Design a protein around this ligand. Sequence first.
Ligand SMILES: NC(=O)C1=CN([C@@H]2O[C@H](COP(=O)(O)OP(=O)(O)OC[C@H]3O[C@@H](n4cnc5c(N)ncnc54)[C@H](OP(=O)(O)O)[C@@H]3O)[C@@H](O)[C@H]2O)C=CC1
Ligand SMILES: NC(=O)C1=CN([C@@H]2O[C@H](COP(=O)(O)OP(=O)(O)OC[C@H]3O[C@@H](n4cnc5c(N)ncnc54)[C@H](OP(=O)(O)O)[C@@H]3O)[C@@H](O)[C@H]2O)C=CC1
Lengths: 488, 488, 488, 488
Amino acid sequence: RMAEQQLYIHGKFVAATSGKTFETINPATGEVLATVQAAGREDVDRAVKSAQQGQKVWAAMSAMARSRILRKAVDILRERNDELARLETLDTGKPLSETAAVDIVTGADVLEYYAGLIPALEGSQIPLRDSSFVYTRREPLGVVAGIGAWNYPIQIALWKSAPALAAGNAMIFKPSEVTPLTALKLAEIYREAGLPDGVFNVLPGIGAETGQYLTEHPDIAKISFTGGVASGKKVMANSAASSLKEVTMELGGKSPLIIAEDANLDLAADIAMMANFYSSGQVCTNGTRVFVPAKFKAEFEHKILERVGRIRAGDLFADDTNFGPLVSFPHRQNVLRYIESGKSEGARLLCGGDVLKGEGFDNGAWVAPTVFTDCTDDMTIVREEIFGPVMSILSYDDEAEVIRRANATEYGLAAGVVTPDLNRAHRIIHQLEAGICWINSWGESPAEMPVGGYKHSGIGRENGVMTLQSYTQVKSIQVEMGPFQSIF
Amino acid sequence: RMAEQQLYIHGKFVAATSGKTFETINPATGEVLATVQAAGREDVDRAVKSAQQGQKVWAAMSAMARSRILRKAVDILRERNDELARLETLDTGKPLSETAAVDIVTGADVLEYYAGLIPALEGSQIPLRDSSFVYTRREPLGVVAGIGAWNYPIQIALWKSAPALAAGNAMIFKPSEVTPLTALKLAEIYREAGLPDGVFNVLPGIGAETGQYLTEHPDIAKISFTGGVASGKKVMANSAASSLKEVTMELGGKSPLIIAEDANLDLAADIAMMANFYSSGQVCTNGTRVFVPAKFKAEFEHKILERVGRIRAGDLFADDTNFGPLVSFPHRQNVLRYIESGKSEGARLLCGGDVLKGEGFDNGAWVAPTVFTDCTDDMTIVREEIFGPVMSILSYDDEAEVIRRANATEYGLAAGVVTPDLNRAHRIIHQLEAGICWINSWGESPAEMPVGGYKHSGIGRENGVMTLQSYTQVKSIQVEMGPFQSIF
Amino acid sequence: RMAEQQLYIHGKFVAATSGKTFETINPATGEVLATVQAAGREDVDRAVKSAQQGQKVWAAMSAMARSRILRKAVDILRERNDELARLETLDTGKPLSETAAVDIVTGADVLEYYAGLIPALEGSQIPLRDSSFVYTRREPLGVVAGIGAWNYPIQIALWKSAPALAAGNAMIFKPSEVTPLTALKLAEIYREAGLPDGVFNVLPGIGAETGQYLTEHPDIAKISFTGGVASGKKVMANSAASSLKEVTMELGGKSPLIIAEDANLDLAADIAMMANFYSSGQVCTNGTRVFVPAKFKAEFEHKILERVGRIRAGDLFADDTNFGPLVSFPHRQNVLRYIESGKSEGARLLCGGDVLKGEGFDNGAWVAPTVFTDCTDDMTIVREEIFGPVMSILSYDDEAEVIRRANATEYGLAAGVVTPDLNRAHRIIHQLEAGICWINSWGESPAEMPVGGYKHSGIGRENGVMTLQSYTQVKSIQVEMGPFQSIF
Amino acid sequence: RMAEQQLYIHGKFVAATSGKTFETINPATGEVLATVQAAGREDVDRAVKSAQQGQKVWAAMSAMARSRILRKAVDILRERNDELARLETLDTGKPLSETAAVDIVTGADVLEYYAGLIPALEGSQIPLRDSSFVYTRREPLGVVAGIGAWNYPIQIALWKSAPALAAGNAMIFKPSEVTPLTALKLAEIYREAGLPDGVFNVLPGIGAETGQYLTEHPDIAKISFTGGVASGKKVMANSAASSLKEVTMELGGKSPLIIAEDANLDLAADIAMMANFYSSGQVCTNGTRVFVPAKFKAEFEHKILERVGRIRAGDLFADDTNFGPLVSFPHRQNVLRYIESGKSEGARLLCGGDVLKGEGFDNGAWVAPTVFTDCTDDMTIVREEIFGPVMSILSYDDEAEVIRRANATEYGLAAGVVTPDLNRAHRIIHQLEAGICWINSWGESPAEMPVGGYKHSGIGRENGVMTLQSYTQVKSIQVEMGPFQSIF
Ligand SMILES: NC(=O)C1=CN([C@@H]2O[C@H](COP(=O)(O)OP(=O)(O)OC[C@H]3O[C@@H](n4cnc5c(N)ncnc54)[C@H](OP(=O)(O)O)[C@@H]3O)[C@@H](O)[C@H]2O)C=CC1
Ligand SMILES: NC(=O)C1=CN([C@@H]2O[C@H](COP(=O)(O)OP(=O)(O)OC[C@H]3O[C@@H](n4cnc5c(N)ncnc54)[C@H](OP(=O)(O)O)[C@@H]3O)[C@@H](O)[C@H]2O)C=CC1
């Protein structure tokens, strides 16, 4: 185990006053990783007052002073990458081959990106006439709150806190109860870099209590939320009911991967694999509806089975392991229910469809890599996000049809097309109703590229210059140098 | 009386299927202006399907083709300015001296502004490496909805529809039941200008029915709302619960006007008058907390009394009338209750405070221009938006004090300072928590200037280039020209 | 003929003070179209003082006031399209089928574009610390000068004057002595639209005198030049010697057209034709080096012969005529000397190579559509711009080879590639050293798209938002609200 | 005495092939600091070939890889600040109290600024129609050249090399022959930070040879020049004659300081001192025309004289020294000729006017702080840049007059106003024809703030986001997905 984990408020660990705790489990073993204290309503109010004090200090510094501090945190994250990756692997079940290469690396990439952009954050000046002009300021929101999810815990913490801090705000961050540990480490790293006390506070807790208290607090100006559609709606409602707060949400999706009739099927199968089985399928952007031309279906299915056979489940700290258990045993039960609905609705099971068994698997939340084919647009496994390693293969006949079917969903997060043809690639992508589109690839999310969902898959965006601006609020100032005219 | 008013769906007037109607009155006389049909749930759905069809036509046109159509609508609005202003005066009670100079003039200014910006709406391109790059598209949201308020009916309709249409969307607009007439005229004008059928539909109705159906419809991508905080919270809740929607809101405020100790008091009194009694006080941005240095309070009060004596209530079509009734008898009743609370809480009534009486007033919702002084921060008239002709004068001693008291409010819409001193003007304005700040002036809202509230006064902004962009959604597209590598 | 043409200064036609005139010829007949007065040094000084006076009036107007006037000029140009096109046909020899479809249409497109962008021209604001901030203004340069070329007289006049006027400057425009007439008509149209006197003055004259006097005047802030490299070098030198002027230049090129190995040869031939024989080959961006794979060369050569045979020379006002004489007889001799160098250097002449003869041609400056093949990179016709209807076809073997050869030139204006392959199209284009690149097309120049040359083909850009900004100069203004510290 | 200084080409010091050397002097003692090799024509050719090779390596790296390398160079400059400042004091004669606080600090500030902006350098995407779109790339120019001046040697090298390198170019930098030493040190620091060989090459030499060879070289795409007007015109001419090159120029000025009638005269005098006597008056932006209201002139003269009496000339490494000799003895002779013209033209010599004498001064190029008053606009010392410690005080009567007189000059670099009045400060500044304007301050040049001259004081700008963009060239790319239509 680890010592009982405390709250982090104003540059130090402090005990919760709630009297409540929870446990986080190692999903590879079922063993308790740590007992964690849960922030109560009074603890949340403490954190907001701490953040208000720290934010004032932070915003009064020069832009380049803020940039240097965030850059030092980047340097620490690079140094402690391997230590942090192993902790993430213990908490989430994702293989170290992933966590040591992606989670902190791309989280730190976004922090490094925003650190350099702070000096470029500018207002505007508008001349109206010789005797009057307008200028604008991009002012901090003040105190903002982030609510993270459990699939990429420290990456999500960095992607929310980086633009928020770079824009001059303090952030109160609540990690998922499933994966609270790396956020507490991130808080220590920020302070070590010189972040003022209160600018990044971490309140572990339960969604129904700690998360709700944050969304209801009158002095929080913005909520940024990552999670499921059901919880996003609850969060949106409560943020409105209490104090009108700006809101950003990434809510996952059912993203389509379109294989064109002129695609190389080895490339298409490779893209489909990476779009479905990285992080054991627990990725919001996964391409879980794979549209394949009817003429290619059988050959494509063979190619998928060939690659699924190369998936190497095992010791999560082993170099060659590239597949892990799911994040929790309750989550596995939900994935298994989806798999059974696929069977009961007549989807053809091509591989997988059960838990993994044997020594080293019986005690972990393992689900075998699963592929259904002969799927149809009305099936539950095609319509609903599963967030596990479950690929659905759908046949199609013509380009206009496949565009219609890809777009006929309430989700809108990602999409992709596989084709060597110039006109086909751009033509199809431009008609797809998704915010993140990949041509002949999948999954890369550069710091420069805004990402977020259409329709029910999200509100607002993350990454890119625009997200730095979305963590400021515009103040317009008119200077009137002429004589003011009253009609009274 | 006018003929019965119908819904406007797909380029024509059409009868509602709800079987329901309401009446709009002339608030200066009590006479019924028109019987108006109310959109039902089925009428809303037809409007959404009409809008979906028209939006596709509109978005497929070239940017300059769209710009030319909106410019033709500007020309028509300029030509009919006086006719539309007279109708607005009949429906709202605002003097023709206001409506003929401001309402259509500034509504059309914003439409004209956005029409010219359509060809400048651009995405981005981000090079990643020799073998891969990203580009973004600013795509239309699709069908958006606007919900208007009754104080500036056609201006609000133009400020909401202009960026939405310019961004390639269709808008369904619901005017306040108090003031539905000019929105219907605007719909005709857009069609005359060549706007494709369905791109601007107008659904009169009640907030509890027609407005709610819009916020709940699954195929509406964004809601833009103007009104009060209480109704704003309900709109946000329904918008989230039904189908996740982008929401923008302007919700009024209690904006502070800070008179510096070196201000010319004639200028200060003139600004305060224009900040409290224009449109009979029914303006969201009004400077209803007037902070005056204690050493000049008595002289300032004298100057206010002189100018209040010049307020001219009378025939709304007479050139010298500069004060009208309130929009309705219920709204006046609410204003009168606030006035009574001021008296009962010990504020000193400097002038006004009662209904107007006599021939020409008995049938209208007229309230005398009212000024309270000796006010304190805990009083109801100081803490709550009244939305009538009620000024609160508060004394202060020092600059740090007045900034603290100006900011000690849940509202955040506007603010202003009166001072000839360079350092004082910018120094104070930069510390004020408001989205719209005026130096030595009040009320001017250029099309170029983003305007909106801090804190509980709103979400998002209107006008300026940023609001055009806010009616698009970003699609990020990565072109991967190198060979894709899978780890499976 | 026509009345003798005068100078246009301060809103009226005025006699030149030079005592000098020149003649413009109808290149289809050899007859004198008009005698035109030539601006002397005193005429230039008068135009500058007029421009200085008009610029002050123009810049004092509101941005939207400027926008409306330029939009009124657009409306007049659309209405007078056919009248202006016939005048352009008489002066240039370009077929009416071109001038009535392109010259005025696209000139007005750019004016219309910039008219709408005037209100979006904004400075910036940069906070330094609580006690100091910076804001910038985008101020007019003042009086700028444009020097036009003879191939697209009225389009060039519009592409230079539109951003200059839209940015708040006055422009003095000197058309080529070969084609002075449409610029004078434009001056009348601008005044009719409400442009203040002096904001657009037109000075016909000779390059060696009027053009040089413009480049030397101390009170002209910027020169914009279109023409050949030889004259371009003189302009930059004289502008530097006299008054440090900002200088923009578009100087033509030897643009490469790359036909890929997987290109449809009918498409390639159509693109090659439009890249070489529009406006009788007198287009700066023409793709006069056509690179074709050796394996396709014989078939491509046949397809070109088929298309050239359909070219229709004849009455320039006839609907089916699509090929005209050259702009002048001196230019034809220059074009013929180049054709002869092609013959003497061993290029294989596929068609043309001589003047056209017979009734309707003996009196005009006609050169037959001419194609050389078997060209090599050391030939005079491949290295130097001819600016007549002379296509050079070059064979190539490998992709890296064609890129090196395409880039092995001091010119850098345009380039294109023909290929259906996604990777090949973008991969090749990213490596070509040209400012204007076309994929599966040629010649389209949207107002939104910045265009200009690399290397010796120009300096700066035209069109797009950036060219509007390039006609302003930045003023940075620091407001220091804190106490200034001196070390003395 | 130091070792003979060599050229720096491709990541190492290398001997020149010119057979030529020069000496740099310590202007405080007249002694030779070092013998320095002069780059010949062949050395320039080698440096270009080195730069072409290194540029390709540098531009192929990721944006963040480049950002990290420049940030490492920042770290070394901060660490070596005092060492570099001491070298600069020895080479230039500027007091260590200046060089250790400003030269490297603000040079490194600009490098640090641009390092963070590399990831934000983006092109655009413009949709034309469903079947076609445009995107733009911001490509490196390639090899650019910077030519420095002797007053701020290492700052100028950093202000030029930072945006050029951050934009992906290689730069060949030629320092002034008066002050070559710190540029060679900077090259070593860049290599130590990981800059690829060839990306920053340094060629000491003479303007007439090394400088001219750079401006004439066909494979250099851009020249950035700092110096005097006379040499700038030569540079502009040669850049055009050889190969059409882009040119940026900062050429000094005669900047006005306008003291308003409501100004505190101690503040005005302090600003005037810092505007005239920092770096012994050798600053391009110095406010050498000080306009004072006639009614305040006598008292202002008293306050200037008192402050001049406090100037402390002496040992340049002593903490309290705040005044140094001029950079060279030839430059002192030129300054003394200007002083004599002031005397002979009837200006009243208020103080100074001679060399400093005595132990510690006879061997240095010292000129006493000099103030003239009763100046008139036609005097040589009022019209020409002196670049020494010579203030000219001019009386004025009214605001319109002083604006007219401030602007009646061919220079346009800087300007300032001293006033506590909001309207006066902005109103006056907006009318001044200068690129750099200070309100109630002088001299601060934040990295975010674009700086450069109007009129004869320069072309283009330095610092700010726009200067990063100015070191790229735009490529516009149209993708045509529809069928191309030929008229042939
Ligand atoms: N910021 C501003 O510009 C304005 C602020 N106010 C403030 O609001 C106070 C109350 O006035 P009131 O007229 O009740 O204001 P509301 O905010 O209720 O009315 C504004 C608009 O919202 C609509 N609306 C009301 N309820 C709903 C709902 N559940 N769903 C969707 N739309 C709805 C109304 O429809 P309908 O009116 O047809 O019922 C109207 O079109 C005023 O005293 C003032 O303080 C009011 C108007 C303007
Ligand atoms: N704006 C500013 O910051 C500065 C302005 N000045 C002004 O310039 C005046 C003259 O001083 P001076 O030293 O002659 O200034 P220059 O402008 O001649 O020197 C500036 C730089 O230009 C170089 N240079 C000179 N001639 C050429 C050429 N033909 N081709 C290329 N590069 C060339 C110089 O080389 P090198 O010095 O090695 O000969 C030096 O590197 C000063 O009195 C002052 O008024 C001077 C310095 C700074």
